[PDB]
Structures are given as structure tokens and as C-alpha cells.
Amino acid sequence: IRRDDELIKSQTGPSVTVTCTEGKWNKQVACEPVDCSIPDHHQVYAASFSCPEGTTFGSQCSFQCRHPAQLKGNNSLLTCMEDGLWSFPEALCELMCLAPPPVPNADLQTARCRENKHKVGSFCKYKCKPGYHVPGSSRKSKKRAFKTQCTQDGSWQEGACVPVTCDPPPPKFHGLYQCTNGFQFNSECRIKLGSNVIHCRKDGTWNGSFHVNSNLKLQCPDGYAIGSECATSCLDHNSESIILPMNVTVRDIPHWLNPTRVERVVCTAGLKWYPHPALIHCVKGCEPFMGDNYCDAINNR
């Protein structure tokens, strides 16, 4: 209603009264069609809406599901009804996750996980093979099973069994060690009677051990002999020594890096070069300000 000349107004309802006054009608009325809202959500979940006509009365809109989602129903159209709202969808995009990708070094305990039809919220129990484990555990505790589920996108959660990393060799013959596979599975370590071959098995057990600075200060009792732990410390108690063998200085460390702790230099065979005093650097160490409900910008690392 666009009123032009009027004195009083009366709520007639769905209709209205138009009065002729001095050669012109008092009101300008216009029966505009109802405007349904643009379909974004709340009608069909996880689908694309593309109306070929519009969002007015009598217009019909087309929705199509995502590639993971399936579609069941004879009609796939939404009608903007007389009520100003879209009608009920006769076809729903049922969300069904597809077949999972083959995770390496894993056993599918659930027989239904090898199929292709899977609903959202299915649980597959994957068992890690011997010599492999799910990441998250150390070499002491062994966990070899995990669960994977279908997400709301339509894809499975990621999970793989990493190889079990073998135990480190003792530092008596370390540095000159030459493993065939390194830290991977089935690593045979032998330096250039006893145990000439070391078998890193599926459980990661060691069958046999090997058989025959200006800033940083160390005070060993034996000196140049072997078998003694040396007290390695910096000149000041405020600084902490760390091992950075990959050409990293004191000021070159980023905030996300996790340097290893200082290891006491045990003398190996020959010269003790595997821990090197020039390689160990004294950097700005931590201070007892932990758990004090205060953020420290210096120790924000």
C-alpha cells in the first residue's frame, strides 16, 4: 500500500478499501508476490542450490548433492510455496563415506571396512603389524591398535603405523657405528665372537651390545680414560648448555625448535669426538618462573 490522500486508516486485513476522491484514487495498491529466502542451509544439508528462475512465488529451485553425499528420491526440486517458505524436500542428500584408502603396514580387523558402503560414524579398528606401531607411544609401552572414523566432510581420519625405531647404540662405539638401515626396521649395526650382527627385531629389543671449551667446562675424574661421567656445566648458572651439531649457534635457534639436553661426554673408543665441546653451546637457559600465572616473553619458547 502506498497511500496518497487519506484521513484515517483501518486494518481491513488481507483486502483493502480504495475510495475515489476528486478524480483520483486515494491509494496505490500492488499485490507483489511473496519472496522466499535464498536457500543456503536449513533445508537440505551439504548441497548446492542453483535456482534457474528466482526466489518468488511459483519459482522452483534445483539442489544437487556433494560428491561424497548420495541422493535418493524421484524429485530433486524445491518449491517456494504460498506461505513464503520453501516446501519439504522429497529427496535428501544422505551422507555416506566411501571406501577408506589403504593404510600401509596395517591389518583391517573389521571385515566391513574393506567394502565401499559406509555410514558417517562408522568405526574401523586397524591393528599395527609387528615391527610397526601407532605414533604417540615410546619404546617401552607398545600399542598396536587404533580406531578410525568417518568425519562430517565425508573422509576418514588419518592414521598410519610408523616403523618401530630401534634403540640407540651405547656411546662406547657410537659415532663410528655403521648400521645397514639406520633407525628403521631390520637395522644391522656393526662398526668397521660376541655379537657381530645386531638384529633389531619387531619388538625393538637389543639382543646384544657392542663388543670390543672456553664456555663449557667439564671435570672428569678419569680424565682422558673411558668409563667416567664428566660434570659438564657452563661458567654461569644462568646459562644452559645444549648440543647443536647441525651448525646452529646461540642466537640462531627459532622459537619452535626443541634442542636436546646436554649429555655428559663419555669417552668413546679413541678420541671422544661424538660429543664435541666446541659443538656444545651455552645459551640463555630457563628460569624458575613456571606455573606462576605470568607469561614470560624471554621464556616464551
Binding site: 536449513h42 544439508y45 506461505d83 519439504f88 535428501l92
Partner: protein, 185 residues
Amino acid sequence: PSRALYFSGRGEQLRLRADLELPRDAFTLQVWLRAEGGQRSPAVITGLYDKCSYISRDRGWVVGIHTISDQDNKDPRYFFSLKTDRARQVTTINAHRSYLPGQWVYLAATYDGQFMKLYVNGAQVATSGEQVGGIFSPLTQKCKVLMLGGSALNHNYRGYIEHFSLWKVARTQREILSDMETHGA
């Protein structure tokens, strides 16, 4: 004789089995209840909830007790909330007086397709006409569930429920008064 359920605040709530079809076009809820003194703020009595959806889980209809002033929780009244799948805004219906914590109340809620009305003890209290059409599509008939005495978010109810009655059609005020005077027989 006549027996009633006592719903506590500890989490005691029931669930209707799926063998009965939920109403779609029109419905009428008739419940004899005895509310206790201090309820929670969003506390419900009987609701029709959605369990297979994640975009909007606040569909369906829900009858309960809630405060009209959310910032102060001063006076709690009976309320009837309805949000159909076609609609976009949930509109609530309140009562006209604070509920009596020691008297039996015959609460009735009607929805026909155009108007929803709330009868407290046989008298029509409020009527809203914003919810139109059916409440859900018949394709998702099995997904909707009916909960009694609580919700999925632990909206517990404290009180007595005496005679549950849910109809598949909308009934006028004379039928409401007749069902009041005939009790459950």
C-alpha cells in the same frame, strides 16, 4: 487407581519408542502435571527433538517452564516453543501468570497448521500464528524422537506427571474441557 511419575532433577528422563508415528500436520498435547517449586531456567516437560541433524538441532516442538526475563530469571511461566523445518525463526508462547508450585495444572498445547494455542487449566492463554505448515517432512519421520521429562542437554524436570495424552489431530476448546472432565477414561 491412578498412578503418577515423579521426575527428579538427578537426570531421570524417559524416551518414547519408535513404533508409534509422530504427528506431522496437527497435534494436541494434554498433560496433567504438578510442578515443584524451583525448576531450572530452560527446563522442559515434553519435547520433539531431532537426533540425525547437526546444522540446526532446535527443530520440533517443546513444552516446558521458563522465565520470560532471561537477564533476571524473575517469574517462571509455562511456555510452548515450535520451530518447523520450513520456518526460520522459533516463536515462543508464554502463559499469563506465574505457575503455582503446589497445584495440579491441566496443560494443553494445540497446533493445527496455522495457529498454535496454549490452554492452562482449560482457559486459552496465548495463540500465535507465525508457524505454518507441517512440522517435519515425512521422509525424516523415523529420525525425530519424543522425549519426556528432559532433553539431551540434561534439562531435567522436577514434579509429577499424571496422565499423558497426545493426539494426532488438533482439537478445539470443548474437546479439551471434555478430556479434562473425563480424566483418562
